[model samples]
Target: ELPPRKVCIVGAGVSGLYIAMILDDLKIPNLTYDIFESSSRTGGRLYTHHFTDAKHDYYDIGAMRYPDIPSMKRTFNLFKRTGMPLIKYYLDGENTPQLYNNHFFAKGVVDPYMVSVANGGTVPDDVVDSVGEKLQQAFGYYKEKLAEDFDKGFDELMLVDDMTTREYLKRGGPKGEAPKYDFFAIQWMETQNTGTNLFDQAFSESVIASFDFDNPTKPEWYCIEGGTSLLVDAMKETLVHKVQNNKRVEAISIDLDAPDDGNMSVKIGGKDYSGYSTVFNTTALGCLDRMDLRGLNLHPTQADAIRCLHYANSTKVALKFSYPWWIKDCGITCGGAASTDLPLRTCVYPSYNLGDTGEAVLLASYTWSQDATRIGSLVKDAPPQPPKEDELVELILQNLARLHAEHMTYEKIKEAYTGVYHAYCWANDPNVGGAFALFGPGQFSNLYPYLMRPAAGGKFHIVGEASSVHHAWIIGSLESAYTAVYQFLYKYKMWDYLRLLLERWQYGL
Candidate 1:
């Protein structure tokens, strides 16, 4: 009989936590594990930081909302099982915030103030109508023809996998000319749908995004009340002392001649810990690459997958205001994004204390893709300069002044701003090299399959949003965790236990 195994889960993110939680639930007598988080805290990208002075004011530097969609079955199931309190996240509405495009103001097409730029100045009505018709044709083809056949149509989709979203849109219809308005509509939809720019991503990725766009089951977004970290708090109940914080697994090596047959040795800082039968990496692929992996005999495809998978640079700049100026001055009552053509591509007003009697936090800049890269590049040069935090604040405030020139000014911002500002460029952080994963043309088809496979003769398994199709959500993280545990069970020849887990959890395995 196989002996009880000792596992090491690297990175105490949602994925690692879920893996531990599930294994404990199975009560597998032979399975023991330790969760090592390099960071001083858990939750990984589900980070929420509060101001020292203003207790209530907080900003989610990472993931914010959880969409209750059919695809997101695992996340809601976990929420229900954990009893994590959730509040409706107001993404968009009639009273939603205004889009600050160049210097103009308008409501978002789908959600509030979600635009990178109004490329077409104050878009003409006929142009808007033309784009609407074109979109109907494009979306109709996607929904009716392609959506149902996606799994079947993957080979056909791969024909255009090398194409960009712009190229696909241009070549979608027989006319072969993408309407100018289609560009604007998709530019707005890009950030909302895909988290990164559509132009640079694979056409298949954009197709997947559209599938989610028209999915009727996609429910209104919601987030854990108080903070998303509360979900971590609930998860840790089962984890307890098994979670070892500040224990960063710096490198992983295989010990072929260990006493217990073979084991995976995890290097923390400069020291190595051996005797771990399995090493499940729940960290992002890029972050994982930062660790030493010279000991593993990785396949050429596996090596390519590791080196090729793209991690998006993302930046979030949050500033505390003396009061809810958006509600008081601009009539934006709830939480909604305001986008612009400036470097601060998007500004998100807080939904926590709308119309409340206290100071509030506003995300002055929430940029991904090139915009995020631009912000992050400010510090990436030789000598490794500090991100000019004050400069970014000043620029965003100036942009805000322009966005609401009639009602506000830069000087007014200087007055109302509480002087508490924080900027986090995920790419710049040592522990987290990038915000999340993004796939490029053909990379998904070519590289992703190898990444999902077990490495080092099934001793090393990877699980994270990067490896999953969901990409940037906690749901993806959870599902990947489920997959890792599933593989572990299968490796241990625990079929009955796996069946029990499947029956009990109803996870999207």
Candidate 2:
């Protein structure tokens, strides 16, 4: 048996927290670690804005939805482990409204915006109603074979790993057939369905995520009952040691000549904490890049992945109102989201407080990619505070009124506004840099392996959601931690420990 080793973990995000949990639970003979977070909080992107002390007076600003899918069983297990309460989160309601191209359309109605085809627009008449079908059916080959055998199907889908959603549709697809969509049709689908420039991501991402959204079984989605903060609180309470907040790590150092046997060190707050056997940089890749990693000795191309991997921007604005106008009056009582072609992009109704009396919170605006940048321009870096008055509030009420045109007026929405609002732009958060890791074109196939493998003679690892196949989700961060720990055990020939891990956390199974 080898002697015990000291470890270093430089993040308190879910990835860092989950790894800490595993290492501590294993009871690996006096194994101790220094877990540090740059920010004052531990949840990272899983933030929740608590407007009041009451139960449903809060809104989850980050990662508000979790689908109960087979692949995400580990995340579900984590929920149970932490005793975090779950509430059903609806994706759509029969009365959910949509405003596209200045025209209001109710759910299940045919799009009237495509009427622009006669006015010099490119989206064809027949293609407007069938956009979802076109995108889903395009992945028919991979989805069918994946259901048959995962490895085989996944390997085959890699054949088109370099294609974007637009390119995949425009360039005859994987079957090498003629192009099914032109430039205008592809743009129309993307704008109507997702945010601007979202379809530019690698087709592999679309295919992988499609399993969750378009599953044959129709998975149910949930959010933490109070907020995602409860989940973070649960995780923190169970950790073996308290996570040190506001302890920013400036640099990471490793012995270049001997990575395995030599010592690793980290410079935090000007003092050098040396002699760590293993080091994990669980920070978002951008944050990791800011740290001095030259001493860790990652290869140039591998290092480039940390600096260059695509991360989509996201922004959220939650508003507290004097009443549940959307519910009692506007027919959003069932809890769903409103989509619009306006800069507001999406306005999500609260799932927790269906019709809570007095003050109620609504996710007034949520956007991603280019849409996020636009709304984000008006958001504060540190938010959840009341906006005295602004373009953010002005447009929020204006578009909200438009979405509920049949029921509420702009003046009505403004009168009910409590003026207590929270706005945040993920792109502006230096620690995270961007909201989510969204692979583009060849990123999934080409740069993914570089992240999976540990650097610096297998002693230094980069682990987080960005490095996972399930990027942008909690399951990704959890899976990355599990894999990182597993690799560490296997690297050192800790066969018994490795077997022990598999016994409890069998992700593949």
Query: In the order shown, what is each candidate's alpha-carbon RMSD?
Result: 4.8, 2.3
The reply for model 2, stretches above 4 Å from the true place, is 106-111, 114-120, 144-152, 256-262, 381-388, 507-509
How many angstroms is residue 124 displaced in model 2 relative to the true structure, after the best TM-score fit? 0.8
Q: What is the TM-score of each candidate against the true structure?
A: 0.85, 0.95
What Cα-based lDDT does every candidate model obtain?
0.71, 0.82
- Let me know the TM-score candidate 2 reaches against the reference structure: 0.95
For candidate 1, give the lDDT of residue 434.
84
Q: What residue pairs clash in candidate 2, if any at all? A: 202-441
How well does candidate 2 score on lDDT at residue 249? 88
Cα deviation at 203, candidate 2, in Å, is: 1.4
